[PDB]
Amino acid sequence: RRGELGFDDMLSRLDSALRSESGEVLAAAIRTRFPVAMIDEFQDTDPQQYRIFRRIWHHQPETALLLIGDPKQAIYAFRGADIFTYMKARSEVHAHYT
Amino acid sequence: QLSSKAADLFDQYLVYRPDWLAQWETGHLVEGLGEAQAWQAPLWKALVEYTHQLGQPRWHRANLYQRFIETLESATTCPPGLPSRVFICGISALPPVYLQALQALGKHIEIHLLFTNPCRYYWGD
């Protein structure tokens, strides 16, 4: 009603935009904008953020996803981060580098 | 908000892109542009038809600019009310879209454009 927005409201609105039918084509527009992604600090990853990144860069060709992080540094569980999202991301991907 | 953003884009096209709106008034598209063109050119044509249907005048920035170029290029006799010499001090004292009108005005009015370039040789493209 007031037309305002929050910090988590950006993540929720982008997840609701990608949750729709046409918004997947919007993700293709993101594949027209940035055909690469290097994501630092993946231990502090919300499940909405990982759902967005999985909807954009799962298995489409010519785009690369590089999740750089550390599971031993996920200490922001009070803030909203979750190490089980990192374990789901580790179970989904196949390559691992240290 | 959509009408305000489209009016902002139409004002920016009236300032900077007169040929695009002149082609959109006829009903023809421009080859080589982005995806956001199939909803702007019929909207611009409907805007022109709506302001022609209403009592508002037809004239805007771009067509009056073209009419000014046409009435300064074809006229042999200089119209009255014009000054003798016009000084333009600086680069931002004229945006780089009225240079055709400046070339039309230079046929009848002596125009001294004081240009401030950092280099003395040619360094452009």
């Binding site: 037309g3 919007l26 010519e62 | 908000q1 953003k5």
Partner: protein
């Protein structure tokens, strides 16, 4: 990669804004150092030595690094919420967002107002036998909001 990319096509995502500024400065310094090492065909770093040994051409790589140094001001190194807000403001038609919105830093006041509205619309018309249990669970809406 199948094709080289520009500075406006490489997306780097880091949560902390000072971390993004430090990473942008470090990437700019690495671009300048690799441009110097490619113009000189020598370096004092072994990883930079292998980077110089991997390329066959030196002039085109130095020109690309000079263009990267010039376009580093328009680099796509954003935060999480910054990239999400840029994607919402860029493609506003597919997302269904407004064009100008006001951002509030603290949402605790609106959350307390909504919790007070919930407590007014729920706990007020209850009788004594239910309000006794509601009072035994929480003293007021502040304890529920703290929970």
């Amino acid at each position: 990669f199948p094709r080289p990319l520009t500075v406006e096509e490489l997306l780097v995502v880091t949560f902390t804004e000072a971390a993004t500024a430090e990473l942008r400065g470090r990437i700019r310094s690495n671009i300048h150092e690799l441009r110097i090492a490619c113009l000189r065909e020598t370096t004092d770093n072994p990883l930079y030595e292998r980077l110089l040994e991997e390329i066959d051409d030196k002039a085109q790589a130095a020109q690309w690094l000079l263009l990267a140094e010039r376009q580093m001001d328009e680099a796509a190194v954003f935060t999480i919420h910054g990239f999400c807000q840029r994607m919402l403001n860029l493609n506003a038609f597919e997302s269904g967002m407004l064009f100008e919105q006001q951002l509030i830093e603290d949402e605790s006041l609106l959350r307390y107002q909504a919790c007070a509205d919930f407590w007014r619309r729920h706990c007020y018309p209850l009788p004594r036998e239910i309000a006794q249990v509601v009072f035994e669970t929480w003293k007021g809406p502040q304890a529920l909001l703290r929970d």
